Design a protein around this ligand. Sequence first.
Ligand SMILES: OC[C@H]1O[C@@](CO)(O[C@H]2O[C@H](CO)[C@@H](O)[C@H](O)[C@H]2O)[C@@H](O)[C@@H]1O
Ligand SMILES: OC[C@H]1O[C@@](CO)(O[C@H]2O[C@H](CO)[C@@H](O)[C@H](O)[C@H]2O)[C@@H](O)[C@@H]1O
Ligand SMILES: OC[C@H]1O[C@@](CO)(O[C@H]2O[C@H](CO)[C@@H](O)[C@H](O)[C@H]2O)[C@@H](O)[C@@H]1O
Ligand SMILES: OC[C@H]1O[C@@](CO)(O[C@H]2O[C@H](CO)[C@@H](O)[C@H](O)[C@H]2O)[C@@H](O)[C@@H]1O
Ligand SMILES: OC[C@H]1O[C@@](CO)(O[C@H]2O[C@H](CO)[C@@H](O)[C@H](O)[C@H]2O)[C@@H](O)[C@@H]1O
Ligand SMILES: OC[C@H]1O[C@@](CO)(O[C@H]2O[C@H](CO)[C@@H](O)[C@H](O)[C@H]2O)[C@@H](O)[C@@H]1O
Ligand SMILES: OC[C@H]1O[C@@](CO)(O[C@H]2O[C@H](CO)[C@@H](O)[C@H](O)[C@H]2O)[C@@H](O)[C@@H]1O
Ligand SMILES: OC[C@H]1O[C@@](CO)(O[C@H]2O[C@H](CO)[C@@H](O)[C@H](O)[C@H]2O)[C@@H](O)[C@@H]1O
Ligand SMILES: OC[C@H]1O[C@@](CO)(O[C@H]2O[C@H](CO)[C@@H](O)[C@H](O)[C@H]2O)[C@@H](O)[C@@H]1O
Ligand SMILES: OC[C@H]1O[C@@](CO)(O[C@H]2O[C@H](CO)[C@@H](O)[C@H](O)[C@H]2O)[C@@H](O)[C@@H]1O
Ligand SMILES: OC[C@H]1O[C@@](CO)(O[C@H]2O[C@H](CO)[C@@H](O)[C@H](O)[C@H]2O)[C@@H](O)[C@@H]1O
Ligand SMILES: OC[C@H]1O[C@@](CO)(O[C@H]2O[C@H](CO)[C@@H](O)[C@H](O)[C@H]2O)[C@@H](O)[C@@H]1O
Ligand SMILES: O=N[O-]
Ligand SMILES: O=N[O-]
Ligand SMILES: O=N[O-]
Ligand SMILES: O=N[O-]
Ligand SMILES: O=N[O-]
Ligand SMILES: O=N[O-]
Ligand SMILES: O=N[O-]
Ligand SMILES: O=N[O-]
Ligand SMILES: O=N[O-]
Ligand SMILES: [Cu+2]
Ligand SMILES: [Cu+2]
Ligand SMILES: [Cu+2]
Ligand SMILES: [Cu+2]
Ligand SMILES: [Cu+2]
Ligand SMILES: [Cu+2]
Lengths: 338, 338, 338
Amino acid sequence: DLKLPRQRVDLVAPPFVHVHEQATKQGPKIMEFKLVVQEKKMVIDEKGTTFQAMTFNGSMPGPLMVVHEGDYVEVTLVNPATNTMPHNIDFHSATGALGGGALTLINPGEQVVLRWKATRTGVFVYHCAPGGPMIPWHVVSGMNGAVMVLPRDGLNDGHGHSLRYDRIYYIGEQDLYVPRDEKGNFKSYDSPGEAYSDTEEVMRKLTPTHVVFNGKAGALTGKNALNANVGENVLIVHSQANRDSRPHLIGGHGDYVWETGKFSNAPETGLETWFIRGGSAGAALYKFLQPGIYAYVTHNLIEAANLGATAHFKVEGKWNDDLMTQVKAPADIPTGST
Amino acid sequence: DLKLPRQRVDLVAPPFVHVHEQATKQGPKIMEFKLVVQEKKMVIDEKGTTFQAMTFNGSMPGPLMVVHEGDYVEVTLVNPATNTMPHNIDFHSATGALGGGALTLINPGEQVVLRWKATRTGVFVYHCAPGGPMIPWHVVSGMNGAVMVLPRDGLNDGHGHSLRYDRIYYIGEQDLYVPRDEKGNFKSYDSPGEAYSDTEEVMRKLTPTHVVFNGKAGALTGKNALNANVGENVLIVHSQANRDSRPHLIGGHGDYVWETGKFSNAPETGLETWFIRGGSAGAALYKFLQPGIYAYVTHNLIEAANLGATAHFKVEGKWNDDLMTQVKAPADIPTGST
Amino acid sequence: DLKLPRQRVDLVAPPFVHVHEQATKQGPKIMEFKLVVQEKKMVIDEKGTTFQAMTFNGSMPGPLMVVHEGDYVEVTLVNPATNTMPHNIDFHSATGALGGGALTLINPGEQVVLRWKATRTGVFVYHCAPGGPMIPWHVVSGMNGAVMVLPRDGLNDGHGHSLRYDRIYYIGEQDLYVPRDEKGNFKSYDSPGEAYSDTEEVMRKLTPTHVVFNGKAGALTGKNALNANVGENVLIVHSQANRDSRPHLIGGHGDYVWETGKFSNAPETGLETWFIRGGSAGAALYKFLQPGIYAYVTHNLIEAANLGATAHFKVEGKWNDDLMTQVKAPADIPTGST
Ligand SMILES: OC[C@H]1O[C@@](CO)(O[C@H]2O[C@H](CO)[C@@H](O)[C@H](O)[C@H]2O)[C@@H](O)[C@@H]1O
Ligand SMILES: OC[C@H]1O[C@@](CO)(O[C@H]2O[C@H](CO)[C@@H](O)[C@H](O)[C@H]2O)[C@@H](O)[C@@H]1O
Ligand SMILES: OC[C@H]1O[C@@](CO)(O[C@H]2O[C@H](CO)[C@@H](O)[C@H](O)[C@H]2O)[C@@H](O)[C@@H]1O
Ligand SMILES: OC[C@H]1O[C@@](CO)(O[C@H]2O[C@H](CO)[C@@H](O)[C@H](O)[C@H]2O)[C@@H](O)[C@@H]1O
Ligand SMILES: OC[C@H]1O[C@@](CO)(O[C@H]2O[C@H](CO)[C@@H](O)[C@H](O)[C@H]2O)[C@@H](O)[C@@H]1O
Ligand SMILES: OC[C@H]1O[C@@](CO)(O[C@H]2O[C@H](CO)[C@@H](O)[C@H](O)[C@H]2O)[C@@H](O)[C@@H]1O
Ligand SMILES: OC[C@H]1O[C@@](CO)(O[C@H]2O[C@H](CO)[C@@H](O)[C@H](O)[C@H]2O)[C@@H](O)[C@@H]1O
Ligand SMILES: OC[C@H]1O[C@@](CO)(O[C@H]2O[C@H](CO)[C@@H](O)[C@H](O)[C@H]2O)[C@@H](O)[C@@H]1O
Ligand SMILES: OC[C@H]1O[C@@](CO)(O[C@H]2O[C@H](CO)[C@@H](O)[C@H](O)[C@H]2O)[C@@H](O)[C@@H]1O
Ligand SMILES: OC[C@H]1O[C@@](CO)(O[C@H]2O[C@H](CO)[C@@H](O)[C@H](O)[C@H]2O)[C@@H](O)[C@@H]1O
Ligand SMILES: OC[C@H]1O[C@@](CO)(O[C@H]2O[C@H](CO)[C@@H](O)[C@H](O)[C@H]2O)[C@@H](O)[C@@H]1O
Ligand SMILES: OC[C@H]1O[C@@](CO)(O[C@H]2O[C@H](CO)[C@@H](O)[C@H](O)[C@H]2O)[C@@H](O)[C@@H]1O
Ligand SMILES: O=N[O-]
Ligand SMILES: O=N[O-]
Ligand SMILES: O=N[O-]
Ligand SMILES: O=N[O-]
Ligand SMILES: O=N[O-]
Ligand SMILES: O=N[O-]
Ligand SMILES: O=N[O-]
Ligand SMILES: O=N[O-]
Ligand SMILES: O=N[O-]
Ligand SMILES: [Cu+2]
Ligand SMILES: [Cu+2]
Ligand SMILES: [Cu+2]
Ligand SMILES: [Cu+2]
Ligand SMILES: [Cu+2]
Ligand SMILES: [Cu+2]
């Protein structure tokens, strides 16, 4: 019945994004994606703490899907028989049936195919939602990602000017609730089901033990810093499926920010810190003006520095002393000073 | 001195709203409302937990009041002699005297009459605020509701087009702080005063034991789901007098959202999840496009599924396979699959 | 090389603000500021609790700096040899080098001079950020303030009309994490370093013990209430370097609010409660219409009343009975009443 060209997309692991056009002159297509659920123990912090994760495509976050307004998105969700739990998928971009959740519940050994029309532009969360208490559990165990629905003319500034990014990164932020023993040491388990009761008790107190980007403390620092160059316009998509965040690029700004994440609304300009509501994605464009290291954080700095929520950008280029300069390097305070 | 027609309004219990006009050609009136404080033990969760509530008109939230810009609102607040505490009322819609609180403190056995001019459009919180530590206590014990001040031309989209709702619902969200004994069981008391000291200790740690709509976990699910039909534009007013929330309609969107709640500002379009600042009301319009069950949550999913903060809509009509369809029902993963 | 006039600014302690022009016809200048770090034990609540604070210029918050777009800001940061820790400064208003942090690390007995160009309008946080876990620690120990970069034409309403304030106040909100002993009593220490380990444990649980304006519970109540007069337009700048807040003026509104704090964006009108993202400053203009006491709070009322986060305004002038009046004072409920 639906007679449109079909196009298979190969997803890539975050923070990278599969290839796509910004502006397009192609008409609507059926964009075909496959997500494979993987339950697995994963390392989440720099001390080697593990937890019983549940993922789309083996990553936290799940991969970013990119389509254009008016495309149809045909998703094959697979739940391998090595998994232990039922799973499903809810797209916040989609209309009806609990975002798809009511049409995608699959037991281990099953797959399902859902199609939804991309009628709403923006960045949106997708997440598992099997029912009842299993909804938060699967989400905070890692089963969430995002989808971006671009206007067919690409982004604009809400004032009639086109905006184009040179690079895009997807930062998925995950709140984790890892059980502790009586002495405060993190507990380990042999399966997600075994971890559940103790995890739920932590969840109920609404205070994460870890807040991480790309699935673990330090994931996007060091050798895995995000690259850019002076002069490049970078789109930073940020999602949080369960809990609020307040992104900030240390040493930079958000030139154009859609903190609620929806491209039918004009962006705000020149922000220091923006706000991702739990259960949403947002996006910020920034044109780098200075080389060096930038930290990208949630600006609850306890979370950023002590719970895992810091990424780095490494930006190549030439320093601009007009924007900032060290007029005098550290020196002893003058004895004359009063 | 004030020579305007008077109109008595009969309030109705949330989530329903008393009858009113959207657009009106009536001039300003003195709109007369009565609120009666009721202290009573109430059931707040599906396991039968009770707590010593304090209410306007016997409900959590208090009822939604609806007037138009330039009306005067004349409120008789009654504190029956069966109550134990003084009470008052602060309207965030009002100008002066701490929103009215400084003019409305009444002991049991007293009533007072306050008039305020509806100079500011939007949805607004009202709440009790007796003074000092009693302010948060009375609020988190249930003494909060909302008022909507409509423009006399009704709502608009901020771009010169009228917006009209077919139905309106008021969702009051309440954070509760129920004491526990040493084993974790919820404690019961014979009066609000007896509950206070233990409740304050819970409050101080800023983590609710329950987060509920319409006064209890499950209040708006099952037989009390909210009704709508495909094609109807529904206004969902959401308030939170003490603590942030992030509303989300699962399977839907916010077509037009005033998350800060004030109609002099253009709404945002096409949101997935919006944000109600503690101490405010906001509102979202959505036109239903698909039948079935929708969950309406705060998108901290722990709160939603595990602390009580889920409502349902039951929407009648015909399914639109163009927007969403199950292309292939759950099936065994092909043996060929790699 | 940079050949512009230089102008030394003398800072003043919050909540007051150093003298400045709104609109100016002066061209760009090098505006010279000095900040002196002071580590000291400070009283933070009305029961006399102390903690080992770290400050810019001896105050929490640090003082508000005011410049205009296109000015250069040349800051001498001094770390006296009586201090124990290294310190630095990150300006969210600045571009490059982690906001300046990477160019300003000074040991006790040193000073440094940083210049940054004020290319971005709005109110912005500045804070210490020495590296790693020391970043949140120094910030939540008090080392944060704000800077305002005004357009050279002053403020506007985003619709072509000038806005001018008669008074400005800077409210810095500080979340504090004071250790407790086994019985719940707050602990005291002889130095910041001695307090660190126990403080970090409190920080990790993300629940402040105190939330204060101007450095202590009650700082801006009583004799230190903020003054205004009926008819005056007051700008209230609010910052929070680490944690979200939801400001509300009890009995008033935000006539024009830049909750994200950046003057290139039109303000929202007529808000009840606004939202300061942790890691940002915002600002609200209000024209007082009624005399009397107003409370200014974060509208988590537990925080406001029980953790310290209430300020007062005392407003002189004549009461307007048209906006609000007590129609009937408290009286016994009529025996006839049903
Ligand atoms: O012996 C515990 C010690 O080993 C580490 C090694 O990296 O991790 C082990 O214990 C953690 C806490 O139970 C588990 O999360 C992990 O699976 C296990 O390898 C340290 O993190 C830990 O302190
Ligand atoms: O807004 C994008 C997309 O939403 C649809 C519904 O699929 O329309 C919604 O939003 C419209 C514009 O705000 C409303 O007029 C409409 O009533 C509502 O359903 C599409 O028609 C539109 O392209
Ligand atoms: O945090 C409580 C208490 O637990 C200990 C181990 O007994 O450390 C645990 O907690 C730390 C904070 O989350 C982690 O860094 C560590 O991996 C974990 O074992 C104590 O060191 C701490 O005091
Ligand atoms: O890219 C930052 C990197 O560049 C170096 C020179 O190789 O210094 C530049 O950047 C500094 C600011 O971080 C400037 O103060 C300096 O003048 C400029 O040359 C490195 O020192 C720095 O790590
Ligand atoms: O015996 C306690 C058991 O009874 C229930 C019955 O619905 O509730 C009682 O105890 C609760 C916890 O103290 C009270 O809140 C309630 O008032 C009382 O009826 C169960 O909830 C509870 O576990
Ligand atoms: O804005 C609605 C209503 O507010 C009043 C005061 O009661 O005006 C306020 O807002 C105006 C428009 O933003 C400001 O110009 C004015 O100074 C401020 O008091 C009413 O006059 C107005 O209708
Ligand atoms: O939550 C702590 C601990 O308390 C127990 C009773 O000892 O359950 C209480 O807490 C649950 C979570 O809030 C409630 O569902 C229940 O109504 C309440 O009695 C334990 O079951 C729980 O482990
Ligand atoms: O209204 C939802 C309700 O309708 C039924 C048919 O009575 O199925 C419709 O809705 C489904 C999506 O929830 C579609 O997949 C189906 O094709 C459509 O007929 C019920 O199954 C469903 O509960
Ligand atoms: O004896 C403790 C008692 O004295 C007070 C006096 O104002 O404060 C002392 O103890 C506090 C808690 O340790 C310290 O913060 C403070 O430095 C010290 O003067 C009371 O606050 C306290 O309960
Ligand atoms: O926006 C104020 C200020 O920012 C600068 C960079 O220092 O420009 C940024 O914002 C512009 C307008 O949004 C973008 O066009 C530009 O690419 C971005 O760097 C200044 O040029 C501008 O005055
Ligand atoms: O809050 C726990 C418990 O501690 C005590 C002292 O044992 O009080 C402390 O905590 C109060 C709440 O923060 C403070 O008002 C007080 O300054 C502090 O000593 C008990 O009174 C309280 O029950
Ligand atoms: O400024 C408030 C202050 O003024 C007094 C008179 O001196 O009363 C005025 O304000 C009241 C509202 O707070 C009005 O109800 C009253 O009619 C008006 O005169 C004081 O009572 C009040 O503290
Ligand atoms: O180690 N994780 O269960
Ligand atoms: O059923 N989900 O675990
Ligand atoms: O400026 N960043 O913490
Ligand atoms: O049972 N409530 O006190
Ligand atoms: O005085 N109020 O409980
Ligand atoms: O999509 N709702 O959790
Ligand atoms: O008393 N402060 O450490
Ligand atoms: O190094 N800062 O404490
Ligand atoms: O209206 N203030 O709590
Ligand atoms: Cu799942
Ligand atoms: Cu969701
Ligand atoms: Cu009350
Ligand atoms: Cu209030
Ligand atoms: Cu410092
Ligand atoms: Cu910062």
